[PDB]
Amino acid sequence: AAAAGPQVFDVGPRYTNLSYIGEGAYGMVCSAYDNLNKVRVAIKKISPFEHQTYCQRTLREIKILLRFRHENIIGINDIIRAPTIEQMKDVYIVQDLMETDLYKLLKTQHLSNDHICYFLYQILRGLKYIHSANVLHRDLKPSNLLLNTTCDLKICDFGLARVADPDHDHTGFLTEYVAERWYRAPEIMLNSKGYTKSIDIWSVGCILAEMLSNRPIFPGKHYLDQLNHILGILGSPSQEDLNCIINLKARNYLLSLPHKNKVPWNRLFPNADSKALDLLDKMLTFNPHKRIEVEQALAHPYLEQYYDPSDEPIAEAPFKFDMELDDLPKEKLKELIFEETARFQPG
Numbered sequence: 211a212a213a214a215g216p217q218v219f220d221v222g223p224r225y226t227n228l229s230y231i232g233e234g235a236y237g238m239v240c241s242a243y244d245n246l247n248k249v250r251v252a253i254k255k256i257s258p259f260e261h262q263t264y265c266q267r268t269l270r271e272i273k274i275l276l277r278f279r280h281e282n283i284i285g286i287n288d289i290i291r292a293p294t295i296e297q298m299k300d301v302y303i304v305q306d307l308m309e310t311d312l313y314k315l316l317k318t319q320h321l322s323n324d325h326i327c328y329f330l331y332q333i334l335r336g337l338k339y340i341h342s343a344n345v346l347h348r349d350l351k352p353s354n355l356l357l358n359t360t361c362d363l364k365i366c367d368f369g370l371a372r373v374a375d376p377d378h379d380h381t382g383f384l385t386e387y388v389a390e391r392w393y394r395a396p397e398i399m400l401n402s403k404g405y406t407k408s409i410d411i412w413s414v415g416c417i418l419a420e421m422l423s424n425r426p427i428f429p430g431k432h433y434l435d436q437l438n439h440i441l442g443i444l445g446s447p448s449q450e451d452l453n454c455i456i457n458l459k460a461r462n463y464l465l466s467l468p469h470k471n472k473v474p475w476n477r478l479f480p481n482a483d484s485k486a487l488d489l490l491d492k493m494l495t496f497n498p499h500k501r502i503e504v505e506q507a508l509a510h511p512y513l514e515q516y517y518d519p520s521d522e523p524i525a526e527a528p529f530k531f532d533m534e535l536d537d538l539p540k541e542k543l544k545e546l547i548f549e550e551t552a553r554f555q556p557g
Contacts (some may be wrong), residue, residue, distance in 0.1 A: 215239055221290050221302050223255055228253075232317035235369065236264045237300065241307055241308055242288075253286060254303045258547075266535045267369035268301070272550045274345060274368040277527055282357060284308070284366040284470030289554040298548060308356035310363060312417070316424050323483050325361065326421045330385035330489075331362035331508070331516040333414055338504045340365070341407050342524030344374050347388040348404050354422060372530045375405040383459035384433065391436050392416065392426045397498050399437045400460035409499035411507065415493030422479045422486065427494075438467075444496050445472035451497040486511035 211220040214228050215238065223230070225242035232239050237255035246253045270487035275286045288304035312329065321329070326463075333355065340347055347354075347368065348556030354367040370389050381403045387394060389404065398404050420428035427443070430436030441447070446469050455461045475487040482490075489510045492502035502510075508517055535543070 212377055214238070218252075218300070219302075220396050221256055221294075221304075224288070225251065225290075225304070231295050236268065244304070247287075250307045250461050252307045252417065253290075253514065254305070256298065256301045256303065259299065259540060259544050260316065262538075262540050262543065265540050265547065266538070269421075269535060270533065270552065271368045272547065273531075274305075274343075274371055276529045276550065277529070279523065280336060280339040280523065281362070283339060284365055285363040285432065291548070292549055293555065293557065295544060295548045298544070301547065301551060305366075306358070306364070307362060308355050308362075309360060311353050312350070312355040312357060312363075312421070313353035314533075315357060318421060320419050320424065323486070326418070326486065327512065327515065328361060329355070329357075329363055329421060330414070330418055330486075331513050333365070333381075333417065334504055334508050334513070335522050336363070336365040337410055337414060338470045338508060338522055339525055340371075341374075341410070341504050342485075342528065344528040344530065346372050346374050346405065346407060349481060350394075350410055350417065351390045351393045352417060355417070356486075372405060373532050374407055377401075378404050379405040380457070381543040383457055383463060387433075390429055391430050391433070394436055395498065396437055396440050396496055399433060400464075401455055401457040402498070407504070408501045409503065411493050412498075414507070415490060418486065418490050418493060419479070421492070422482045425428045427478075440494075440496070441467065441470050444479065445470050447468065447496050447503045451500075454497055454499065455483055483512065487512070488512065 211218050212228060214230050219228055219240055221242060223243060224246050228240045231235040231241050234254050236258045239254050241250050242253050256268055258268045284305050286303055290302035292298040349367060354365060356364040356366050361413060379402055381401060387398050391412040392449060393416045394407045402407040416427055428438045428439040447464055452461055452464055475490055479487060489507060489512045497499040508522060
C-alpha cells in the first residue's frame with residue numbers, strides 16, 4: 211500500500227505519482243496521475259466510520275454529488291474502497307484537480323471586475339442547479355469554491371447540505387449553527403434553522419462583498435457579533451422586517467439595540483461597478499422573503515454578458531423528501547455508504 215506523510219494513501223492501480231496537497235475533514239488530500247484519463251486528479255481520503263456525524267456528512271455529500279451533474283458543481287469521478295464492508299476502513303473520492311480555491315486566491319490576488327462578474331455568474335449558475343434539486347448547500351464560502359487554471363469555478367463540500375424544508379425552518383433565538391459564522395444569514399441567529407433557499411443567497415452576497423475588497427464583509431468574532439456586523443452596515447431593520455420576526459426573544463433583542471443607519475455600499479466599495487453594488491444590495495437584504503432569488507440574480511444587469519437561461523440547467527432528479535439520516539446508527543450509515551459507492555467497483 212502506497213504511503214504519504216505515512217498515512218496509508220492506497221489508491222489502486224489507476225492512480226500514481228501522489229503529491230500531498232493538504233488535510234481535509236476526515237482525512238488527507240493528494241493529487242495523483244489518472245493513468246486511464248491521462249490527467250492529474252484530486253483524491254480525498256475519508257475515514258468517517260467511527261462517528262455517526264462523520265458518516266452522515268460523508269453519506270450526504272456522496273448521495274448529492276453522485277446525483278448532480280453540472281459544470282459548476284464538483285463531480286465524483288471515482289470512489290476507491292475495499293470490496294467488503296468488513297474490509298472498508300476508508301473511502302477515497304476522486305475529483306477533477308482544481309489548482310486553487312477562492313479563499314486561497316483572495317489571500318493574495320486582486321480580482322478584476324471581469325473576474326468578479328464571471329465568478330459570481332458561475333456561483334449562481336451552480337446554485338440555480340442545487341436549488342432546482344430542492345437542495346440547500348448551507349456552507350457556501352470562498353474555500354468551498356474551487357477554481358482551475360482557466361478560472362472554471364466548481365462548488366464543493368455538501369457535508370452540511372439539506373433538502374429544503376421552509377415549513378420546518380422556525381426555531382428559537384440563539385439556536386446553535388454549524389456553517390461558517392461569517393457567511394450566515396441574519397435569520398440564523400434570530401429564528402431560522404437554515405432550511406430555506408434564501409440562506410444560500412446571503413452567503414453568495416457575503417462572497418461577492420469579499421471579492422470586491424479581498425476582506426470578509428461581516429467578520430463576526432462570536433454568534434451575536436455576526437448580527438452587530440450585519441446591522442452596522444445594513445442599518446437597523448425596518449418595522450416591516452421586524453413584524454416578520456414573530457419569535458418574541460429574537461424581536462426584542464433587535465428592539466434592544468441602538469439605532470444604526472445604513473452604510474452606503476459605494477462608501478464601502480468605492481472602486482466597485484455600480485451594477486455589482488445593486489445586486490449586492492439585493493443579496494444582502496435583511497428580510498429573507500424580500501431577498502433576491504438565484505434566478506433573479508442571474509437575470510440582474512451586472513451579469514448580462516453571461517446570462518442565458520437555456521445554458522443554466524436545472525436538475526433532472528430533485529430530492530423531493532428529507533434524506534432521513536439524522537438518527538441512523540453508524541453501522542447502517544456505513545452500509546448506505548458501501549451501497550452508494552458500489553457503482554465504481556470492478557465488482
